[PDB]
Design a protein around this ligand. Structure first.
Ligand SMILES: CCCNC(=O)[C@H](CC(C)C)NP(=O)(O)CNC(=O)OCc1ccccc1
Ligand SMILES: [Ca+2]
Ligand SMILES: [Ca+2]
Ligand SMILES: [Ca+2]
Ligand SMILES: [Ca+2]
Ligand SMILES: [Zn+2]
Length: 316
């Protein structure tokens, strides 16, 4: 909507205070004009009609329990925008500053979040498996990254291409979490998953097997559940990415770590210049090797490490 840019204050899902960019016109709306063509956050009001209504607030203070998922969806979308712009010179998910839209309070007891082809959508969780999912910066960045993938490589959401799609979202979700630098880790969704259980997470990139996800191609799932295991087989690629960044010896294969920034550069280039909708794991390896070659040279440690990592997870 048309109005003047304002700065509200509120509390997120985890109880932390933050400032948020709003727009004033009679009400204060969750509309951040400071980034691209705007970040807009909507109330789905426990229903499934999308987007719902642009979030309106009378006083620009967002401290009510009902406000918390909106505060975080809005704020973490901003952080994710900043990551892509500042680190990769990418303007929003389409590269042309597309408006970024999110809806919170989607459905009832909804233990998931998704990109619906046009916007991000966050459940509140049932209070047992999840609390409101926008409370996780890695989750928000995971969702926005699906939009980036859809506008670039276009990885089909099933089987190997779908597992790559998932891993790309986990990788950049994690890199955004490190970018913000608040309790960063290589786990996925730990801030909003299972409030009654400390120390766990939805997935682990450092050790996918801790939750039964494969960490080697020989352990890949080939059934039909979960679109051919897109949230399962992502572990194989997540592990490779973790090794590229952090190093380690995995099934006897040693990988020299090159750090998060170079991991991000290599995978961003692969995603935007080499991957296609039908890319499989072997083709991702080739794309990553070529990307590292472009960036660092054929004889570089970076190229050698990419090869080591894919060797370690059994992807040739
Ligand atoms: C919890 C179940 C698995 N979900 C996830 O791993 C993450 C959320 C995590 C990061 C907390 N959600 P996601 O992967 O975006 C869910 N994906 C999903 O719903 O895709 C299916 C789909 C939805 C709309 C349009 C096309 C296709
Ligand atoms: Ca208020
Ligand atoms: Ca964390
Ligand atoms: Ca995390
Ligand atoms: Ca937990
Ligand atoms: Zn996903």
């Amino acid at each position: 909507i048309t109005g003047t840019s304002t700065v509200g204050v509120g509390r997120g899902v985890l109880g932390d205070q933050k400032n948020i960019n709003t727009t004033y016109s009679t009400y204060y709306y969750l509309q951040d004009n400071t980034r691209g063509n705007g970040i807009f956050t909507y109330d789905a009001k426990y229903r499934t009609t999308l987007p719902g209504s642009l979030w309106a607030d009378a006083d620009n203070q967002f401290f009510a329990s009902y406000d918390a998922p909106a505060v975080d969806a809005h704020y973490y979308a901003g952080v994710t925008y900043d990551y892509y712009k500042n680190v990769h010179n990418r303007l929003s998910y389409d590269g042309n500053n597309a408006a970024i839209r999110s809806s919170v309070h989607y459905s009832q007891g909804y233990n998931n979040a998704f990109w619906n082809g046009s916007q991000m959508v966050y459940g509140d969780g049932d209070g047992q498996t999840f609390i409101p999912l926008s409370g996780g910066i890695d989750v928000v960045a995971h969702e926005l990254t699906h939009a980036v993938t859809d506008y670039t490589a276009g990885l089909i959401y099933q089987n190997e291409s779908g597992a790559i799609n998932e891993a790309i979202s986990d990788i950049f979700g994690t890199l955004v979490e490190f970018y913000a630098n608040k309790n960063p880790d290589w786990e996925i969704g730990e801030d909003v998953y299972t409030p009654g259980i400390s120390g766990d997470s939805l997935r682990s990139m450092s050790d996918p097997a801790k939750y039964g996800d494969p960490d080697h191609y020989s352990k890949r799932y080939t059934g039909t559940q979960d679109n051919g295991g897109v949230h399962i087989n992502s572990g194989i690629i997540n592990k490779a990415a973790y090794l590229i960044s952090q190093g380690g010896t995995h099934y006897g294969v040693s990988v020299v770590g090159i750090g998060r920034d170079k991991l991000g550069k290599i995978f961003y280039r692969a995603l935007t210049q080499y991957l296609t909708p039908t890319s499989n794991f072997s083709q991702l390896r080739a794309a990553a090797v070529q990307s590292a070659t472009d960036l660092y040279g054929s004889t570089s440690q970076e190229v050698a490490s990419v090869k080591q990592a894919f060797d370690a997870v059994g992807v040739k």
